[PDB]
């Protein structure tokens, strides 16, 4: 079962890896050193540890192959994401990090392509041998999410991986796990029930990343997790990434890394709270007023529905409403840039059924409490995210369910990534044709 080798009598009778393999191109440094803190503190990043890596800009000046840099930029994207600008130097030069993001984020490329540099310079698999590279994750979603981009990175060499989650059969991954996988990404509770039987080992594992360490506590794989890695030798590079910091986080960082950098690039992210569904439609804003009678109607047979509608400008509550009222709606259009005498009883009759539905700006969106807000509609997309967060958060508290529609088109691009950010936290569906902003 446990035996928990001591790693001073086993350790300098194993073999020894190499794990930095940055060039740290000069176009990176010199810069230098009020753009790279401007970019950083534009991404929001706060990192402190010992010497920490320029970020790198581009994907040249990331010092990856080309077996990896080519099917990297071959997925058609620019100027790679803030999480990968400033985790790829870092990973690649082998150091340990925790990194705090939302559960969510662009994070597992973050890691994976230096944990598949990190393979290619270690000999091979020499049968009997088992992973090189070590993923934990919560969740068998993850897992699956994970591998993707395994063997999409790792198909161009040998790269071999296997999940090992639980709920599908415990005999196919026996079979998967006989078969030399040099990447394994486990659920901490099926990777302890197949180190028992002794299907895989842990005794070539040099790289080590814990996902969404966090919510891998919550659910009490703790036990689990810290009888895994004292079986993993402890000059290990070792990667930690986790959207909440609680003190057994705080503690799991202390007792398993070495001299790490912490880079936080997300904003100690907030709840939006799961007793929400999140409708998003990918749209034109051509044919949007077309989808607004559709979920106006789905909502308005239900009594007493009260529906809270949001658009860009103010003058355009008044276009939504003079179309809205027009063919029977009680709609009345809240802003200020009229009369504020008589803005303030369209709320002594919205929150009684006098006039359900109330159209508004994010500016008008100001420290009114009408709470009782069903089924609340996007009808333009904010700019920011903290925004949509408070306005799909005045539905369903106190009767703890809502439902929230956004209306999603291409002027909103640099924030459909950090939208899917905001869902996958809330465990929610998620539109098949919006997934296309998930990365970068």
């Not at 981009?149 to 599908?168: A, D, L, P």
């Not at 919205?350 to 359900?356: A, E, L």
């Given at each position: 079962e446990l035996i928990k080798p001591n790693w001073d009598e086993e350790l300098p009778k194993l073999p020894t890896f190499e794990k930095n393999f940055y060039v740290e191109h000069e176009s990176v440094r010199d810069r230098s050193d009020s753009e790279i803190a401007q970019f950083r503190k534009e991404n929001e990043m706060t990192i402190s540890g010992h010497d920490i890596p320029k970020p790198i800009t581009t994907f040249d000046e990331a010092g990856f192959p080309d077996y990896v840099l080519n099917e990297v930029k071959a997925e058609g994207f620019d100027k790679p994401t803030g999480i990968q600008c400033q985790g790829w130097p870092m990973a690649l030069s082998g150091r340990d990090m925790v990194g705090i993001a939302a559960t969510g984020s662009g994070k597992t490329l973050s890691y994976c392509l230096p944990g598949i540099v990190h393979i290619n310079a270690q000999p091979l698999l020499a049968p009997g041998d088992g992973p090189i590279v070590l993923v934990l994750?919560?969740?068998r979603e993850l897992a699956v999410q994970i591998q993707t981009?395994?063997?999409?990175?790792?198909?161009?060499?040998?790269?071999?991986?296997?999940?090992?989650?639980?709920?599908?059969p415990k005999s196919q991954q026996i079979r998967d796990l006989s078969r030399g996988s040099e990447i394994v990404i486990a659920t901490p509770g099926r990777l302890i029930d197949m180190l028992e039987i002794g299907k895989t080992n842990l005794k070539r594992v040099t790289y080590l990343v814990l996902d969404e360490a966090d919510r891998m506590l919550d659910m009490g794989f703790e036990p689990q997790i810290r009888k895994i890695v004292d079986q993993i030798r402890p000059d290990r590079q070792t990667l930690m990434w986790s959207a909440t910091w609680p003190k057994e986080v705080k503690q799991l960082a202390a007792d398993?890394?070495?001299?790490?950098?912490?880079?936080?690039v997300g904003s100690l992210e907030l709840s939006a709270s799961h007793?929400?569904?999140?409708?998003?439609?990918?749209?034109?804003?051509?044919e949007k007023r077309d989808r607004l009678?559709?979920?106006?109607?789905?909502?308005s047979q239900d009594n007493e529905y009260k529906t809270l509608i949001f658009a860009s400008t103010k003058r355009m509550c008044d276009d939504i409403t003079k179309?809205?009222?027009?063919?029977?709606?009680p709609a009345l259009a809240i802003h200020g840039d009229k009369d504020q005498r008589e803005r303030d009883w369209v709320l002594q009759e919205?929150?009684?059924?006098?006039?359900?539905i109330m159209v508004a700006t994010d500016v008008a969106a100001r420290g009114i409490d009408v709470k009782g807000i069903n089924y609340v509609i996007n009808y333009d997309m904010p700019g920011n995210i903290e925004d949509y967060v408070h306005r799909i958060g005045r539905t369903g508290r106190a009767g703890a369910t809502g439902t929230a529609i956004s209306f999603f088109t291409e002027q909103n691009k640099g924030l459909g990534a950090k939208l899917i950010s905001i869902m996958r936290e809330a465990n929610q569906n998620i539109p098949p044709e919006l997934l296309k902003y998930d990365r970068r």
């Open positions: 994750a919560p969740t981009e395994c063997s999409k990175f790792g198909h161009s060499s040998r790269i071999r991986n296997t999940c090992v989650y639980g709920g599908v398993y890394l070495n001299d790490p950098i912490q880079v936080q007793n929400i569904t999140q409708i998003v439609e990918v749209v034109s804003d051509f009678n559709k979920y106006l109607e789905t909502a179309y809205l009222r027009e063919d029977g709606w919205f929150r009684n059924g006098r006039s359900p």
